Design a protein around this ligand. Structure first.
Ligand SMILES: [Mg+2]
Ligand SMILES: [Zn+2]
Ligand SMILES: [Zn+2]
Ligand SMILES: [Zn+2]
Lengths: 143, 203, 86, 110, 212, 56, 427, 280, 205
DNA sequence: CATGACCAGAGAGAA
DNA sequence: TTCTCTCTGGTCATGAGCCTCTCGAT
RNA sequence: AUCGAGAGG
């Protein structure tokens, strides 16, 4: 059946441009991670992760989705577990898991030790501060 | 004024005459207020209640400045000292107090948004100007402003001047509360945001 | 400090359940149910853990308790049972 | 996966910043970084006791360390130290240093 | 041709009367709106000149003010015809205020004040003396559109405020001690004032600020 | 991502071709156009974070 | 269909992007901001075309705000701490009497305004009234003081006029010309100089870029040769790698330097030829950059200027960052290449130009100034005849057709440019 | 352009395109239009970055502000920023621009609209609007409650005329009464002919009870009770103007059941409209 | 005692003193003998933060995970710099070196420690590394948009993400999103097996 | 690129 | 004379939309 | 990796 509207119809020079889907499409579940930060590599060609940028952190905050936010930042990227001393709250503790022995040289502490889950980038950050002479101490309880 | 040439003749009672001339030309005020370099008469079609009660348009003459001296202009006869207004909300803070500040700050933000035909709900800009004014005076949203507060340490360094904040934290031996959200996202912990503003336990 | 509680008689927070605590309640229960933990409602042909949690919530058989914190450090405990959902 | 640990897992609720005492960096360092070279001497297939070998962490992905015996996935790097022959400033504190030197008397300590 | 100065002096007088009446002092309303001719009658001399050491007057608390603060009392306001108040002109004033055991003295001046005088302002520990400028007081800033009602809180009102919001002193919003309205009511550090403000959302909204 | 509306939870519909597909009346919150625009998808891995998407 | 214009470096095709700069040896007057102590400035960035292309910058500052009195004029000279007042320069160049100085600055005795503006400078240097004491006033750490000043005056002061001694007259007259246009601006007679006129802009092309790089590395090779000579005191050891590897590194990376990261701040000077379509290649071969900055709200350099008509394309420029800073040459647009001015100068001298030493302002008042590459070479009366002759010569071919010639009638100026790097178009 | 003589302030000389895109621009119009379009593009290209940085600073400066379980608006260190969110404790969603009808209009129209004098045969509720219509004349004990209602309406109008000085009536407010009234009219198929069965007491005492049940804060002390009444003042103005006796009986024709349903609806919607603690 | 008007120069401090320079040992042993009360009124804490610890006595080495390598990090470049400068000062100590060769050793040891902590500083000692590249300092490493805080903590690349070109569809529901089959096979949800799903889960496997 | 606080100088009142 | 007072140019210094891609020298 | 360049919304 005819269209009630008549139609503008004729030849017109068109151009096919460099951007085509199959060169852009990208998807990744638990691929390879970087050496330094231990977070996903950058680039579709290296099977990389997309960036959860801090603007998107903002959006997830405004939504109130706290645990999805912590999920993106920890389990989907460079979660890590370190052992820290219960008095000098620093990642100094020598922990052998096979033999169940945790120690803190200098402090002489072997019984007040904790383990905690932080990003590996965060473990980095604190090690870099220590190399910078600043002592980032982390304590389990308020005091 | 009748004579068609307007002349003033001044003798002292020769180079210092040039200094008297410079003083005269530059630093004598004939009239007016110290910073008001221009003034214009406009008409505003303000609406006001009629004696019958319904509102009506009662246009009024208003003068618009090209400069600001709030203190001295406000103390002038013939004007309404309760209705004076400037778009320099910081002068308002200095003369009429912090709360008048807040009100004018909101008015100017509201005007920059509504200028473009946009509308944003009162509470959002209200919160903005409340946080800017909740301290003594006017705190800006840039590195000199909110970011030199007592806002923990790690949250502070997540905006600007990162490593200097960290160094000052080392030196002053700051203790971080770890209730800021940026703190918890840094430690990969659940921040006290809507889902984590409370604990769950069983019956 | 030491036992910063509040008596249930003197409670001033909303008697209604906030959307965020409903979301966390449903998520926690759907987690508990995704692991094979006992369901305390007759799942009438329903298999999704989340919808199991939602139906458990409508019949108020979810036995958790919210601990609402007020900024000084005090808290009010609120059973999911007494909370209004709307 | 990062095996199981007897250590209790709690959360971080306080971060107390401060600065490193010499005594504590002595007391935390498991190695004297004496020699600058990374690799062991004679350009061998090894890491020298001088800087980057001694039980700071493995580099060949082989489960050896200072009382860790953990792979690189599980080993947090262990810190070391170097004794400087004579004290030297900290950049970020120069300003602060001068300011505190700005006005405190050289002789009396107040 | 300086009835300009006359009118401005008279307006500063009206506003200082309004200030101490608003501070909780016994000033009549018929008293404050003294028309200009009556002001000329009382305080302009035979030269038509106004001499403003006669203007100075002693204000006494209302009954409600001793109900809510027993220790408010004995305020006497002094105008100065000596422009550019020097340190020993304030000498004059400060030992006047000390000799009569006055809790608070307000010292309006003209045009200028030496800093050497400024340092001796908190000379007497119990007495408090506040310095003003006529050009400021020619207009009552608190009459202005954008300035809502500040009400000084009693000590127990502030304790109740803190308990019922379970607050710390530092958690409360702040008002600058030299804030114009904080000065207009003689706010002292730590004193809280409650501000009642018109509201686009709720009509009436009450905020609170503490003096810093 | 300037909005809370810049990040919204959707129901998956697996479909043949190579593009992400969405309804026209959701372009405005995203400021989306179909002129070469790209968009990003994130998948929850927990039960409660699934819930957080679906309920907030 | 290939058009050439590119290089092949380690196999990849590489293009040189025309670097746009501001022309040297042209004098511009700039008003100063509202709180500045100084009111206006006359600036020349003096460049020596042949030789070491170092750039000196001479400022003539008019001190005093627009309503202030005691308004003095001082100049900045390349190796002395303080600005020194202009009359002290003048007397150090051998022009002693106040009247002669003003004659060098003011070219009409009936301009009482300009002379009234100059009065405070005559008062400023009244203390210094012979040439030798003027040369003495110089900031060094006694006779060597005078010698240092004498050297500076011909060495670093107005280097583009000449660096040979004995032409104090040309530099005095030119300093006076700069002062004249400064005062013209300060009297609200001429407007501020527009820094975004395209005519005052230059396009460094492949030739000049390669020449600047080649000078640097050839002198490195020369220094190496000299060092090998000294080493062999008693006993052809030329390193061709220096020139070859240097040229190749520049053309390859695009960082126009000898292995310097930030020192050769101009980077991306050499880029891979775009080969996506024919037109993409064609366009990439006519791209210009302007490095003045990469980031900021640079309103005025980014806007299409009136003078861009006919030389740069109105429509074709990137969007976003680098919009307006990246330009594309119009179809018939061309770029000058460089021509010896010396024949032009000789012809001018042969056809009426009186030299600047023999110029006597009050004796030939209505006399057109003649500039050639920003150098004031002399004066000409009857400029209509000379201009007709010059144009007929250029159109005949006897003057290079890329040389440009402008007769500003209402300011009595004639400016000839034999420059390299100015965009022109046929008509 | 070099195609113009000097000192030419003409329209076409200085950039007036008298041609349309349909007819086509001349070369000078083309170039001048290009000059304008370039300014457009650069304004675009840098406003983008300036607003990106502005948004970043806004967010990082406000990021920690959240509604707490006492509805105070605080930050990381607990410092109060607002004592109640948005000065009314309402979520910014489910808030609609409804008009306050006691602002504006003549006092003549005002009193025609809300005044009922049971002591005036001409200004009382006609028996066409009420089952108790003809018992109601005289009856000073019902006129006392009606006088109380009218006096509150008057106090409200002056309060609202001194809040919104311009006389603006339409403001964003939490419960759309207009639609609840239309919902009532439709649910109960009100026929606008038979008189209601509401007692004047029904309407009056019910509206006052409803104002009592509009909680935003719940502590039982005078500070927070006054905070509560401050929060609902504007809305209660809207409510009184909307649920005034002559309005309910003569503009709406609400039966008693429909009116009670309106009351329960307003309460339900209102308490829904409060912000949730934890809101960021 | 009269005390000097102090001023900056490079990275050492000099005072007019109504003349000389102030050793690191100098200021530091002034800093040991300060009473505790003036620490604390000066904003310092007796346990964590004492001004004597602003000076650096002996420097903590970070482990390889901070400075990993086919290549070699700039941080270990600069650490080897610091160490050989330090052992050179030790040698010049042991060999009774001249009066102002010790100042070269000292001044550059401090230059090296300074540049290892933070490289961008006024006076423009750029401190370029191998291949004429400026040494990346720890400060510059954790500073900036792409720095550690803003780049790996406040935001990061994440797993279970996808991205591609979008187009519209008249026939999807507004809350829906079209997932290409390739993406939908690339991303996975972890599902604990239960009686309610075990059959469809076995089918999926 | 470009907008702007901190000293450090030196002119500048009072007792 | 002292002391507190204003009180401005040379500085050094900050960030500067998000992603996203691809390429190309060291 | 690092530096840089081009491009896309
Ligand atoms: Mg688009
Ligand atoms: Zn320890
Ligand atoms: Zn280990
Ligand atoms: Zn001492």
């Amino acid at each position: 059946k005819k269209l009630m509207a008549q139609i503008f119809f004729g030849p017109t020079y068109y151009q096919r441009l460099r951007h085509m889907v199959d060169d852009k499409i990208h998807a990744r579940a638990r691929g390879p991670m970087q050496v330094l930060t231990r977070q996903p590599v950058e680039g579709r060609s290296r099977d990389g992760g997309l960036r959860f940028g801090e603007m998107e952190r903002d959006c997830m905050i405004a939504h109130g989705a706290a645990s999805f936010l912590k999920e993106r930042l920890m389990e989907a990227s460079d979660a890590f577990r370190v052992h820290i001393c219960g008095i000098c709250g620093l990642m100094t503790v020598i922990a052998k898991l096979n033999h169940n022995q945790f120690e803190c040289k200098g402090c002489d502490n072997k019984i007040d030790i904790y383990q905690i889950h932080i990003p590996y980038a965060a473990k980095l950050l604190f090690q870099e501060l220590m190399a910078m002479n600043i002592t980032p101490r982390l304590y389990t309880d308020r005091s | 004024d009748n004579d068609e040439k307007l002349i003033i003749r001044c003798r002292v009672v020769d180079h210092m005459l040039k200094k008297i001339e410079n003083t005269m030309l530059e630093n004598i005020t004939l009239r007016g207020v110290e910073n008001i370099e221009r003034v214009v008469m406009m008409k505003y079609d303000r609406k006001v209640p009629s004696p019958t009660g319904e509102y009506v348009k009662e246009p009024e003459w208003v003068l618009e400045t090209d400069g600001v001296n709030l203190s001295e202009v406000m103390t002038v006869p013939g004007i309404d000292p309760t209705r004076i207004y400037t778009n320099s909300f910081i002068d308002i803070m200095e003369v009429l107090g912090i709360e008048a500040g807040r009100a004018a700050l909101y008015k100017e933000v509201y005007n920059v948004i509504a200028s473009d035909g946009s509308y944003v709900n009162y509470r959002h800009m209200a919160l903005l100007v409340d946080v800017m004014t909740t301290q003594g005076g006017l705190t800006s949203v840039t590195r000199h402003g909110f970011n030199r507060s007592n806002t923990g340490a790690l949250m502070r360094c997540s905006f600007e001047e990162t490593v200097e904040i960290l160094f000052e934290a080392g030196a002053s031996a700051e203790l971080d509360d770890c209730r800021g959200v940026s703190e918890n996202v840094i430690l990969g912990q659940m921040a006290p945001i809507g889902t984590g503003a409370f604990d769950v336990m069983i019956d | 400090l030491k036992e910063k509680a509040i008596p249930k008689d003197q409670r001033a927070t909303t008697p209604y359940m906030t959307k965020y605590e409903r979301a966390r309640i449903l998520g926690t229960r759907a987690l508990q149910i995704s692991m094979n933990a006992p369901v305390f409602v007759d799942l009438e042909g329903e298999t999704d853990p989340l919808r199991i949690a939602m139906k458990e919530l409508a019949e108020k058989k979810i036995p958790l308790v919210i601990r609402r914190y007020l900024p000084d450090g005090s808290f009010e405990d609120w059973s999911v049972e007494e909370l209004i959902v709307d | 996966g990062q095996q199981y640990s007897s250590a209790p897992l709690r959360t971080v609720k306080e971060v107390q910043f401060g600065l490193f005492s010499p005594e504590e960096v002595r007391a935390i360092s498991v190695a004297k970084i004496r020699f600058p070279e990374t690799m062991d001497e004679t350009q061998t297939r090894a890491k020298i006791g001088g800087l980057n070998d001694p039980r700071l962490g493995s580099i060949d992905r082989n489960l050896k360390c200072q009382t860790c015996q953990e792979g690189m996935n599980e080993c947090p790097g262990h810190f070391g130290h170097i004794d400087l022959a004579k004290p030297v400033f900290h950049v970020g504190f120069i300003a602060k240093i001068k300011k505190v030197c700005e006005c405190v008397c050289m002789h009396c300590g107040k | 041709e300086n009835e300009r100065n006359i009118s401005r002096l008279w307006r500063a007088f009206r506003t200082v009367k309004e200030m101490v009446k608003d501070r909780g002092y016994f000033i009549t309303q018929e008293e404050v709106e003294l028309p200009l001719e009556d002001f000329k009658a009382k305080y302009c001399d035979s030269m038509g000149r106004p001499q403003r050491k006669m203007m100075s007057f002693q204000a006494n608390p209302t009954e409600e003010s001793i109900s809510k603060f027993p220790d408010m009392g004995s305020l006497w306001v002094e105008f100065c015809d000596e422009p550019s108040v020097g340190v020993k002109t304030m000498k004059t004033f400060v030992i006047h205020i000390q000799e009569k055991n006055f809790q608070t003295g307000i010292f309006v001046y003209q045009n200028n004040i030496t800093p050497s005088a400024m340092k001796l302002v908190p000379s007497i520990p119990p007495a408090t003396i506040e310095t003003f400028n006529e050009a400021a007081l020619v207009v009552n800033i608190t009459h202005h559109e954008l300035v809502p009602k500040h009400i000084r809180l009693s000590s127990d009102e502030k304790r109740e405020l803190l308990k019922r919001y379970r607050l710390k002193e530092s958690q409360l919003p702040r008002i600058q001690r030299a804030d114009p309205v904080a000065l207009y009511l003689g706010l002292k550090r730590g004193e809280v004032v409650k501000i009642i403000r018109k509201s686009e959302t709720s009509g009436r909204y009450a905020s609170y600020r503490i003096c810093m | 991502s300037l909005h809370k509306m810049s990040m919204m939870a959707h129901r998956v519909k697996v479909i043949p071709y190579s593009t992400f597909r969405l309804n026209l009346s959701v372009t405005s919150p995203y400021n989306a156009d179909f002129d070469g625009d790209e968009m990003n998808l994130h998948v929850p891995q927990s039960e409660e974070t699934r819930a957080e998407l679906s309920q907030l | 269909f290939d058009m050439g214009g590119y290089f092949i470096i380690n196999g990849s095709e590489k293009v040189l992007i025309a670097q746009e700069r501001s022309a040297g040896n042209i004098v511009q007057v700039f008003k100063k901001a509202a709180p500045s102590p100084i009111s206006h400035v006359a600036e020349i960035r003096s460049a020596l075309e042949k030789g070491s292309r170092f750039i000196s910058t001479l400022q003539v500052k008019l001190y005093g705000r627009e309503g202030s009195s005691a308004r003095t004029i001082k100049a900045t000279l390349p190796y002395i701490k303080q600005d020194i007042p202009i009359v002290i320069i003048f007397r150090a160049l051998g022009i002693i009497p106040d009247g002669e100085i003003l004659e060098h600055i003011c070219y009409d005795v009936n301009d009482w305004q300009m002379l009234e503006m100059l009065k405070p400078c005559v008062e400023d240097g009244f203390v210094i009234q012979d040439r030798e004491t003027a040369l003495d006033f110089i900031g060094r750490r006694k006779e060597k003081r005078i010698q240092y000043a004498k050297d500076i005056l011909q060495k670093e002061f107005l280097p583009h006029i000449t660096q040979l001694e004995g032409f104090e007259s040309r530099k005095a007259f030119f300093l006076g010309y700069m002062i004249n246009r400064l005062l013209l601006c300060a009297l609200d007679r001429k407007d501020q100089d527009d820094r975004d006129h395209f005519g005052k802009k230059r396009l460094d092309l492949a030739g000049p870029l390669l020449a600047q790089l080649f000078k640097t590395l050839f002198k490195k090779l020369t220094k190496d040769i000299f060092r090998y000579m000294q080493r062999t005191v008693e006993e052809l050891a030329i390193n061709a790698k220096t020139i070859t590897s240097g040229l190749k590194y520049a053309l390859a990376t695009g960082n126009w330097g000898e292995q310097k990261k930030a020192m050769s701040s101009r980077a991306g000077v050499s880029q891979v030829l775009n080969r996506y379509t024919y037109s993409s290649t064609l366009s990439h071969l006519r791209r210009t950059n302007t490095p003045i900055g990469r980031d900021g709200k640079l309103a005025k350099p980014r806007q299409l200027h009136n003078t861009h008509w006919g030389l740069v394309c109105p429509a074709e420029t990137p969007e976003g960052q680098a919009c307006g800073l990246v330009k594309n040459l119009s179809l018939m647009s061309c770029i000058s290449v460089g021509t010896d001015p010396m024949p032009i100068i000789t012809f001018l001298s042969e056809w009426g130009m009186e030299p600047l030493e023999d110029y006597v302002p009050h004796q030939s008042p209505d006399a057109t100034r003649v500039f050639v590459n920003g150098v004031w070479h002399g004066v000409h009366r009857n400029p209509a005849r000379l201009m007709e002759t010059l144009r007929t010569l250029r159109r005949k071919g006897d003057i290079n057709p890329e040389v440009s010639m402008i007769r500003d009638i209402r300011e009595k100026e004639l400016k000839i440019f034999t420059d390299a790097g100015r965009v022109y178009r046929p008509l | 352009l070099p195609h113009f003589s000097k000192d030419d302030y003409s329209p076409e000389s200085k950039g007036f395109v008298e041609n349309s895109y349909l007819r086509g621009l001349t070369p000078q119009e083309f170039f001048f239009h290009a000059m304008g379009g370039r300014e457009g593009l650069i304004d675009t290209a840098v406003k983008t970055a300036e607003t990106g940085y502005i948004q970043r600073r806004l967010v990082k400066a406000l990021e920690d502000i959240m509604v707490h379980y006492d509805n105070t608006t605080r930050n990381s260190l607990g410092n109060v920023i607002q004592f109640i969110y948005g000065e009314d404790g309402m979520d910014a969603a489910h808030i609609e621009k409804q008009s306050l009808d006691t602002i504006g209009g003549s006092d003549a129209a005002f009193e025609k609209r809300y005044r009922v004098d049971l002591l005036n045969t001409d200004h009382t509720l006609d028996p066409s609007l009420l089952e108790s219509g003809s018992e109601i004349l005289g009856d000073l004990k019902l006129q006392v409650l009606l006088d109380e209602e009218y006096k509150q309406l008057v106090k409200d109008r002056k309060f609202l005329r001194e809040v919104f000085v311009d006389g603006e009536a339409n403001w964003p407010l939490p419960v759309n009464i207009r639609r609840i009234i239309q919902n009532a009219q439709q649910t109960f198929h009100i026929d606008h002919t038979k008189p209601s069965d509401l007692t004047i007491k029904d309407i009056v005492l019910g509206v006052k009870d409803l104002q009592e049940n509009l909680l935003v804060l719940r502590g039982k002390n005078e500070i927070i009770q006054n905070a509560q009444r401050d929060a609902v003042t504007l809305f209660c103005c809207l409510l009184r103007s909307r649920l005034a006796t002559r309005r309910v009986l003569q503009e709406y024709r609400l039966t008693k059941q429909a009116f009670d349903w309106v009351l329960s609806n307003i309460e339900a919607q209102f308490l829904r409209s409060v912000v949730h603690p934890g809101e960021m | 005692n009269t005390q000097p008007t102090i001023r900056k120069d490079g990275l050492k401090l000099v005072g007019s003193w109504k003349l000389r320079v102030l050793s690191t040992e100098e200021i530091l042993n002034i800093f040991k003998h300060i009473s505790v009360k003036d620490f604390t009124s000066l904003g310092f804490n007796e346990v964590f933060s004492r001004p004597e610890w602003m000076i650096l006595t002996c420097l903590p080495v970070p482990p390889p995970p901070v400075r990993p390598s086919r290549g070699e990090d700039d941080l270990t470049f600069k650490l080897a710099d610091i160490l050989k400068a330090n052992i050179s000062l030790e040698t010049l100590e042991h060999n009774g070196a001249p009066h102002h060769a010790i100042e070269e050793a000292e001044s550059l040891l401090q230059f090296h420690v300074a540049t290892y902590m933070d490289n961008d500083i006024a006076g423009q000692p750029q401190a370029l590394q191998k291949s004429g590249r400026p040494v990346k300092s720890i400060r510059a490493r954790l500073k900036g948009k792409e720095g550690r805080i803003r780049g790996n903590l406040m935001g990061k690349r994440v797993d279970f993400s996808a991205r591609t070109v979008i187009s519209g569809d008249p026939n999807l529901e507004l809350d829906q999103v079209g997932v290409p089959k390739s993406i939908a096979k690339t991303l996975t949800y972890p599902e604990v097996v239960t009686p309610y799903n075990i059959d469809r889960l076995t089918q999926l496997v």
